[PDB]
Design a binder for this molecule. Structure first.
Ligand SMILES: Nc1ncnc2c1ncn2[C@@H]1O[C@H](COP(=O)(O)OP(=O)(O)OP(=O)(O)O)[C@@H](O)[C@H]1O
Lengths: 835, 116
């Protein structure tokens, strides 16, 4: 039963019983210490990294040994713990030990009453101390005076030392023996604190232990890190090599053999001092409480509130679980517990300061933004790792712009361009591992409570590194110059708008001239700006004026042109998504919504990246204004994570790869008004580009969104819709009834998909006139698809007569695209027809 | 091979291994309801048998070595046996994609079998 009170100071000095994390080792060491005496140098080493609690451990060992020392068969007196870092820089350790030993002895003489025995054993003690003072210069001398030879040849004493000469260890050995007689103890414990704070001063501890602490009446307990003593020992065996030899034999053959010798003298210097059978490894908090399935060797509980009852105290893994899950907006499972495990493997001081800072402000805040509490808690603890890894550190500049830059500068060092945006604690280095949980808190804090910041992190944050894992990585110091150019061109960290990112993102996927020269790309299709001959069928140069209402608005938000030797023109889904990320940010006023469609269309000049060789429109605004009304009351309960945004991009990116190549072929002569799956056109590619985003959001919303604990897709193969709709239709059908079963609505369980499926900007792209897979029986799926969508959003996207025109083989369309199918894709050969 | 052999978790874990996994090229590049049921008793046997598994470092290394070399021969001898007609056929002189992957799987079973 171990309970840690977070509102207590929780310091190594101010830690009483009943909260010792190391209670199994404290008892195990003490009995093993007593066993050694009850049965030669006797040194116990308590291993452990920095912040493990080594000072707190020995502090408990002395407390558990000084109690009932005379009430047990083997009496062991303990000196106060010696801290090698806090001692005077030049004070010998033997001086410190003797000074602390003299105080213990003198205090015992003042407890005696028989003056005959008091005076008999005080003359001996003063004689031994005076003899130690006489020979103390042997340590603090830079030369050997010839007149000291008389001291070695003096025998004017009754000691009758075994070996001749003024051996200081011999003088100290009987000094300890005299002290044991006075204190009436069978041994004396010399506890040495760790040297981790300043480890160059721990050499005197090592040399003193092996020289003067060899007696059977001395028990030495020294803690620290063997990884740190090894560097101290190795650097001192190198000082035994003459400087001239090192300078004259700098070549590898003899240099390597010397290094083999030093590591082979270091190895046995540790084995001589701290024997393996006596070392004790301090267990980190993960090894105590254990995992969910593995039995917890101990039971650690945390008092997360002031005045909390002992029964009320909650388990530490649950306490970390609450902070990690709510702080990162993350749901119970492998991903949430992967962060919790990493926080447990942290040094105890670092972990106990994350919890202390998080739960102190959490309680104080109520007297909420839990992700903000964890962001500040992790910022302070992982600050040394943030500085090392080069992440943003100023707190007045925290925001979306200063976060997407951090995600790019993190995966660049992590080298995980495929899954780095997940921000999982997987990096081998501890600095990048520490930043991963801090960055995850940053993403779960900024994007929380707003849909606009979710899409900016999706495109600018997660996307920018994927648009680097391809289309920029083939060009690769040159790599650091490529990074410098790429982030300056795309202006990540200072983006003007999400749409502005998409237009630059259009060029990089365009300034990489793909094979077959077809102007069909990942999530973007090129369209001709000029008219020529040789165009069969109804294919024609794209004209924006053909579309009406939302149809004109939807393309205007999607069209993006880049200035080059010739003005390329593109229709991307990133521009469509970036437009949504811009409308959501602004207010519900009509004036601001109008500018969103008109931020890029006719006032931007997207020069190619340097790494290249060369009214009814008011009705459209009304629908967007109505949708923005929904966003401002639904997005307040959104809980996006760094995992969800990373996952949603991953599926959305994978689909855009499938639809890119699976439609690079089906661009045949009769593809206009495509009705079979073997014919595709600009209305087909863009329909599944948009439907890819609506699916990636849909499938991994229920999978990973923290608002709904349960899973509503159920168990099955989560195939994604490419050139088809049944894959999307299968999942959207089966989700609907489960919420009715659980008495939950579509908006309070999948707020992200509900908002994006009800966005009028992408509504014309869901059912383009050109893009409809009205097969003999697949049209029933789309008929169900339209019915499901019309019920999710609450409004009929297309009227009964409007739907019949798309399926059955004039009409004006104010809600669906019209001229996209007739558009001519650059680099497409319109000579081969569908067979 | 997961823990607790939970009929739902085994189903949940089975859908992960069959889900399509897409990955990008490395930077150093120049370019079933009754199916889950049959898995249940397999984990019933695994949890009551794997306790006795005593895999050495040499065992794991050696089994791979036979496993690594066999797939070299399979990818080399069948590298030219993709003829025009009847690769499924009747004899071993011709090879198809269903027997390149048959001997690749059989190589793993053999390498485990022979050197265990
Ligand atoms: N038994 C314990 N109970 C409560 N908190 C503990 C305990 N052990 C360690 N801690 C926490 O971990 C921190 C580290 O303690 P400690 O000073 O012993 O570590 P150290 O870094 O190994 O030692 P040093 O201060 O000598 O460098 C403490 O300040 C405290 O916050």
């Amino acid at each position: 039963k171990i309970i840690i009170n977070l509102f207590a100071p929780n310091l190594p000095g101010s830690t009483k019983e009943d909260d010792l994390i190391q209670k199994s080792l404290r008892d195990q060491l003490v009995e093993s210490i007593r066993n050694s005496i009850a049965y030669g140098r006797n040194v116990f080493f308590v291993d452990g990294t920095r912040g493990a609690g080594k000072t707190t451990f020995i502090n408990s060992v002395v407390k558990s040994l000084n109690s009932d020392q005379d009430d047990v068969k083997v009496n062991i007196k303990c000196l106060p713990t010696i801290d090698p870092t806090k001692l005077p820089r030049h004070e010998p350790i033997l001086v410190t030990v003797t000074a602390r030993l003299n105080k213990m002895v003198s205090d015992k003489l003042k407890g005696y009453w028989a003056s005959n025995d008091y005076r008999k054993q005080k003359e001996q003690w003063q004689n031994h101390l005076a003899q130690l003072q006489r020979g103390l210069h042997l340590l603090t001398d830079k030369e050997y005076k010839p007149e000291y030879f008389s001291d070695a040849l003096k025998l004017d004493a009754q000691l009758d030392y075994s070996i001749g000469g003024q051996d200081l260890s011999e003088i100290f050995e009987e000094l300890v023996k005299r002290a044991c007689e006075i204190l009436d103890c069978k041994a004396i414990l010399i506890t040495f604190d760790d040297i981790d704070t300043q480890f160059d001063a721990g050499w005197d501890v090592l040399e003193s232990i092996r020289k003067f602490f060899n007696s059977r009446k001395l028990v030495v307990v020294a803690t620290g890190d063997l990884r740190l003593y090894s560097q101290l020992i190795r650097g001192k065996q190198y000082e035994n090599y003459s400087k001239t030899l090192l300078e004259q034999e700098k070549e590898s053959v003899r240099l390597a053999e010397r290094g083999y010798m030093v590591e082979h003298l270091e190895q046995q210097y540790l084995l001589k001092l701290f024997p393996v059978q006596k070392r004790i490894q301090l267990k980190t908090m993960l090894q105590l409480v254990g995992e969910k399935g593995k039995a917890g060797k101990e039971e650690i509980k945390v008092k997360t509130e002031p005045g909390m009852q002992d029964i009320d105290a909650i388990d530490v893994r649950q306490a970390i679980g609450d902070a990690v899950r709510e702080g990162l907006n993350l749901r119970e499972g492998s991903d949430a517990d992967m962060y919790v495990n990493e926080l447990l493997k942290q040094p105890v001081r670092l972990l106990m300061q994350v919890l202390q800072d998080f739960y102190t402000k959490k309680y104080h805040a109520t007297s909420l933004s839990v992700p903000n509490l964890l962001r500040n808690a992790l910022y302070g603890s992982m600050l040394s790792s943030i500085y090392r890894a080069g992440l943003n550190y100023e707190q007045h500049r925290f925001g979306m712009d200063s976060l997407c830059k951090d995600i790019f500068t993190y995966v660049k060092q992590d080298r995980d361009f495929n899954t780095g945006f997940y921000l999982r604690p997987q990096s081998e280095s501890e600095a990048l591992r520490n930043c991963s949980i801090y960055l995850a808190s940053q993403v779960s804090e900024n994007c929380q409570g707003s849909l606009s910041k979710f899409l900016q992190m999706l495109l600018v944050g997660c996307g920018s590194v994927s648009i680097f894992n391809q289309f920029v990585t083939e060009l690769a110091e040159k790599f650091e110059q490529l990074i410098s150019e790429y982030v300056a061109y795309m202006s990540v960290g200072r983006i003007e708008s999400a749409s502005h990112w998409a237009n630059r993102c259009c060029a990089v996927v365009a300034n990489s001239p793909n094979d077959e020269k077809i102007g069909v790309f990942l999530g973007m299709v090129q369209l001709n700006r000029k008219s020529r001959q040789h165009m069969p069928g109804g294919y024609k140069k794209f004209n924006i004026d053909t579309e009406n209402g939302l149809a004109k608005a939807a393309m205007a938000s999607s069209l993006s042109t880049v200035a080059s030797n010739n003005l390329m023109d593109f229709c991307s889904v990133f521009n469509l998504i970036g437009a949504i990320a811009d409308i959501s940010a602004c207010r519900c006023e009509r004036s601001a919504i109008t500018n969103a469609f008109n931020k890029v269309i006719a006032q931007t000049t997207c020069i190619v990246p340097p790494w290249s060789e060369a009214t009814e429109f008011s009705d459209a605004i009304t629908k967007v204004e109505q949708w923005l009304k929904n966003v401002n009351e639904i997005e307040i309960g959104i809980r996006p994570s760094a995992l969800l945004i990373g996952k949603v991009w991953s599926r959305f990116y994978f689909n855009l790869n499938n639809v890119a190549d699976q439609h690079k072929t089906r661009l045949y002569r009769n593809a206009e008004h495509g009705r079979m799956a073997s014919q595709s056109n600009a209305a087909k590619i863009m329909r599944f580009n948009v439907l890819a985003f609506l699916h990636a959001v849909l499938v991994e919303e229920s999978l990973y969104h923290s608002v709904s604990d349960r899973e509503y897709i159920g168990e099955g193969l989560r195939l994604n819709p490419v050139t088809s709709v049944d894959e999307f239709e299968k999942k959207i059908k089966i989700i609907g009834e489960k919420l009715k079963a659980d008495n939950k609505t579509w908006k309070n369980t999948h707020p992200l998909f509900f908002l994006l499926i009800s966005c009028p900007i992408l509504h014309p792209f869901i059912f383009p006139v050109g893009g409809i897979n009205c097969s003999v029986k697949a049209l029933n799926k789309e008929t169900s698809f339209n019915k499901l969508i019309d019920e999710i959003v609450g409004d009929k996207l297309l009227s009964d007569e409007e739907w019949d025109y798309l399926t059955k083989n004039q009409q004006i369309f104010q809600n669906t695209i019209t001229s996209l199918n007739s558009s001519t894709i650059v680099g497409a050969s319109y000579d081969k027809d569908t067979p």
